[PDB]
Amino acid sequence: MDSFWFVQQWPPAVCSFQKSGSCPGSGLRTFTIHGLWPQQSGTSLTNCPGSPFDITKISHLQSQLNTLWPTVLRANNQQFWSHEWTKHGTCSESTFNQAAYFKLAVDMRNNYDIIGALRPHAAGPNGRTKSRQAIKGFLKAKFGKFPGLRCRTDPQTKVSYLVQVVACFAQDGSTLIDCTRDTCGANFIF
Ligand SMILES: [Mn+2]
Ligand SMILES: [Mn+2]
Numbered sequence: 001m002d003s004f005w006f007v008q009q010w011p012p013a014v015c016s017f018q019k020s021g022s023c024p025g026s027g028l029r030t031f032t033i034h035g036l037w038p039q040q041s042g043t044s045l046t047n048c049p050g051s052p053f054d055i056t057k058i059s060h061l062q063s064q065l066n067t068l069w070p071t072v073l074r075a076n077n078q079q080f081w082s083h084e085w086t087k088h089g090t091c092s093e094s095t096f097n098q099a100a101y102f103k104l105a106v107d108m109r110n111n112y113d114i115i116g117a118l119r120p121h122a123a124g125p126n127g128r129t130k131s132r133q134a135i136k137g138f139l140k141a142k143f144g145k146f147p148g149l150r151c152r153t154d155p156q157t158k159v160s161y162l163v164q165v166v167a168c169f170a171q172d173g174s175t176l177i178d179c180t181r182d183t184c185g186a187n188f189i190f
Pocket of ligand 2: 087
């Protein structure tokens with residue numbers, strides 16, 4: 001790995017795409033952690049063989065994980081954490097064990113407050129159109145590096161919605177770097 005993508009998701013938007021059943025995210029109104037994804041030459045490293053998920057190793061972080069890393073689409077929170085560890089976390093296990101991996105993600109969330117960066121500019125979520133350049137600009141001004149913006153288009157209306165914001169980090173998991181990939185067009189609903 002040569003870097004990490006720290007991905008946060010916007011629950012209300014993510015829930016809108018799940019048209020089959022109920023969804024907790026509608027009740028959640030803040031950015032939550034989707035996951036911490038190790039990267040290699042521009043691609044996400046996934047499903048690396050490694051240690052099985054051990055719930056006891058993060059029992060001391062439960063209160064923080066239930067509020068910052070709740071599941072939006074899956075059955076329950078624990079299942080989501082297990083999924084993230086098995087699909088992404090194992091790929092950086094050589095340097096970060098399970099406890100360290102989850103702690104790092106929690107720290108990143110506490111240090112990267114997206115809503116706080118957007119409020120002053122009245123660019124917070126309000127169901128209206130926002131511009132990609134402006135949002136990226138507001139985050140860059142506060143944190144120092146460009147974030148990555150991820151959008152999804154509704155199959156029916158064809159409208160584009162901001163669903164995730166990515167903060168890019170070097171292999172040390174501490175040095176913020178510029179992200180260089182968005183999946184959002186010039187405008188989107190947020
Ligand atoms: Mn995933
Ligand atoms: Mn899968």
